[PDB]
């Protein structure tokens, strides 16, 4: 109901103290800003008394009474966190005391390698450290984040942890949610380390999933672990009902940086899962923002932040501020956020533990784009700088990559001739040329070349082999691949555009290198067969990999040169892609080579990438 809200004396004092000592940025944080109103607070500085304070605020023309209410909310909301701070640090403290007395005894709670695991395989010392950490943090009934760097064995650590549970009499169904390209590997590992666990790969089309559902609800077989993907756990309301009405103890989520968004439908759909505990595995917990890490923390420890989410998102919604534009209280909240996550998040770094792994290098190759590409780039830049038309950035990087990503060598004249001439084909005898020209307008030069190769009547209009290999990136890439082939190397080549990978296929065919290729179009079932085919057959030289799919969680210990034909605006996609090969078991010094176009937007993206990387390097230490 609506009633007269009486200002309590304690809240009166808190509001008065805050208004007396808040900074200009802090005064801005109060709702109903009207920044002249916040400025008048400094002028209205007698702070005579609370009633005198109200007197000054009302007498200053251009103010409102609701401001006192607004700050009343703010402090209260801040107070909401403060008690949580008090709850959080003790949660840390209650933890950080018990972690100490174990060192007192000669032998403490060193949870050794479980007898269930494969005796012929052994945990590495840091993996044992992580296993002990997970076991003890479970023993206090908390949820953590295993933020070990890419390649340290987080999957093995989780499997050994589940095996330890199974040893302690906990055989409850425990889930695992994995990326699509990784699921096969998971089913492979859970056996090779822990064959005692009964594993259900709940994946496939709706028919196969419904069959699996009918079998399990028949209680046909008892299962300890159910492995699924991110979509198959959410796609149908039947799946959501299945996972809600089951009783699950552990919900492990590989690559938790997919839950970075708090508003993405997968996020709240995944909180709908019934589970006593959850665990997040990620190599990059903080990507570009503190609110992202806050969303992860809300996911992992929901109940203690469940009702207070609105406070957290708003106070962390200051993404637009710079390092110095951050208010003093914002820096304090960042530091105390690091102090809030310090019991939940564990991180280990390969260069600090894995001394036997050879180090990593880099080669930023500046690529001088050829005369034709330079003319095209300058012309398109002049056309766009004048000005809908999101083309400001994307279709500038497209000319950065390859001229064939747009349509320049197929003028409308050639398109009209082809449209009228393809009436001679049987499949398009009834076709309308006036609409064939419309369709061919929006098709790029490489797509038109593929079309010309496809139909017999228009085989005249192929591009010459020199034109399709006219690029600075291609020119440097040919020399690099020849050099590495002579050196007896194997190359993992990345690109963010599918059409770029298609052109790379043609280029490799021209240089007659054997290659494999994986992108999002490849069916989920044979991605593992492709990966094994590359890891075993040593005659395959190049492995084309799209960054989104071929970058997430696969093992590429076979190769030792990772080329990025194009780098990302977000550097962590690149970091995952580079550390695909640089992981446990690698035996060569993994080189990483980035291709960069001279004098383009590519240099600006590289600079911004370096700035973000340095921001992470500062915040992590």
């Amino acid at each position: 109901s609506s009633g007269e809200e009486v200002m309590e004396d304690g809240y009166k004092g808190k509001i008065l103290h805050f208004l007396q000592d808040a900074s200009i940025g802090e005064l801005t944080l109060i709702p109903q800003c009207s920044q002249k109103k916040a400025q008048k607070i400094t002028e209205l500085r007698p702070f005579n008394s609370w009633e005198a304070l109200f007197t000054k605020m009302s007498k200053t023309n251009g103010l409102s009474e609701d401001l006192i209410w607004h700050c009343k909310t703010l402090i209260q909301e801040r107070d909401v966190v403060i008690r949580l701070m008090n709850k959080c640090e003790d949660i840390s403290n209650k933890l950080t005391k018990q972690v100490t007395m174990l060192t007192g005894n000669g032998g403490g709670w060193n949870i050794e390698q479980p007898s269930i695991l494969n005796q012929s395989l052994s945990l590495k010392p840091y993996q044992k450290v992580g296993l002990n950490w997970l076991a003890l943090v479970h023993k206090h009934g908390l949820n953590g984040i295993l933020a070990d760097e890419m390649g340290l064995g987080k999957t093995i650590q989780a499997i050994a942890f589940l095996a330890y549970l199974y040893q302690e009499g906990n055989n409850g169904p425990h889930l695992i949610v994995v990326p699509a390209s990784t699921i096969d590997n998971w089913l492979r590992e859970v056996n090779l380390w822990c064959p005692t666990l009964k594993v259900l790969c709940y994946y496939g089309s709706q028919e196969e999933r419904k069959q699996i559902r009918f079998n399990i609800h028949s209680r046909y077989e008892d299962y300890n672990v159910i492995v699924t993907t991110y979509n198959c756990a959410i796609s149908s309301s039947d799946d959501r009902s299945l996972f809600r009405r089951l009783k699950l103890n552990y919900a492990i989520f590989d690559e938790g940086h997919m839950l970075k968004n708090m508003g993405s439908i997968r996020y709240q759909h995944l909180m709908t899962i019934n589970a006593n505990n959850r665990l997040l595995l990620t190599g990059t917990p903080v990507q570009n923002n503190l609110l992202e890490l806050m969303s992860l923390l809300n996911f992992v420890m929901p109940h203690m932040f469940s009702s207070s989410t609105s406070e957290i998102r708003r106070m962390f919604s200051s993404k637009t501020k710079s390092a110095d534009e951050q208010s003093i209280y914002e820096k304090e909240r960042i530091a105390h956020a690091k102090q809030i996550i310090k019991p939940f998040i564990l991180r280990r770094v390969k260069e600090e533990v894995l001394k036997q792994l050879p180090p990593k290098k880099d080669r930023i190759e500046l690529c001088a784009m050829s005369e034709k590409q330079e003319q095209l780039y300058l012309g398109l830049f002049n056309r766009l700088k004048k000005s809908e038309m999101c083309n400001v950035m994307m279709q500038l990087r497209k000319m950065a990559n390859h001229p064939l990503l747009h349509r320049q060598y197929y003028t409308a004249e050639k398109l009209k001739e082809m449209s009228q001439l393809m009436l001679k084909e049987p499949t398009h005898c009834e076709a309308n040329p006036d609409l064939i020209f419309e369709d061919m307008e929006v098709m790029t030069d490489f797509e038109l070349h593929v079309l010309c190769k496809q139909y017999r009547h228009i085989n005249n209009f192929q591009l010459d082999m020199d034109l399709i290999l006219d690029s600075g990136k291609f020119r440097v890439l040919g020399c690099i691949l020849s050099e590495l082939k002579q050196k007896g190397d194997r190359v993992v080549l990345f690109s963010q555009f599918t059409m770029m990978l298609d052109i790379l296929e043609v280029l490799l065919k021209h240089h007659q290198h054997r290659y494999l290729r994986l992108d999002g179009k490849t069916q989920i079932s044979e991605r593992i067969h492709l990966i094994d085919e590359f890891n075993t057959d040593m005659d395959i030289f190049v492995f084309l990999l799209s960054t989104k799919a071929g970058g997430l969680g696969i093992n590429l210990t076979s190769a030792n040169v990772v080329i990025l034909h194009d780098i990302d605006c977000n550097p962590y996609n690149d970091k995952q892609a580079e550390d695909r090969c640089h992981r446990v078991g690698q035996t060569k010094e993994v080189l990483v080579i980035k291709l960069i176009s001279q004098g383009t937007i590519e240099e600006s993206m590289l600079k911004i990438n370096q700035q973000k990387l340095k921001l992470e390097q500062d915040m992590t230490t």
């Binding site: 972690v99 100490t100 174990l102 032998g107 060193n110 450290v129 019991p343 280990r348």
Partner: peptide, 9 residues
């Protein structure tokens, strides 16, 4: 500080 005590067992 727990990572420190983990090796300190």
């Amino acid at each position: 500080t727990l990572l420190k005590t983990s090796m300190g067992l």
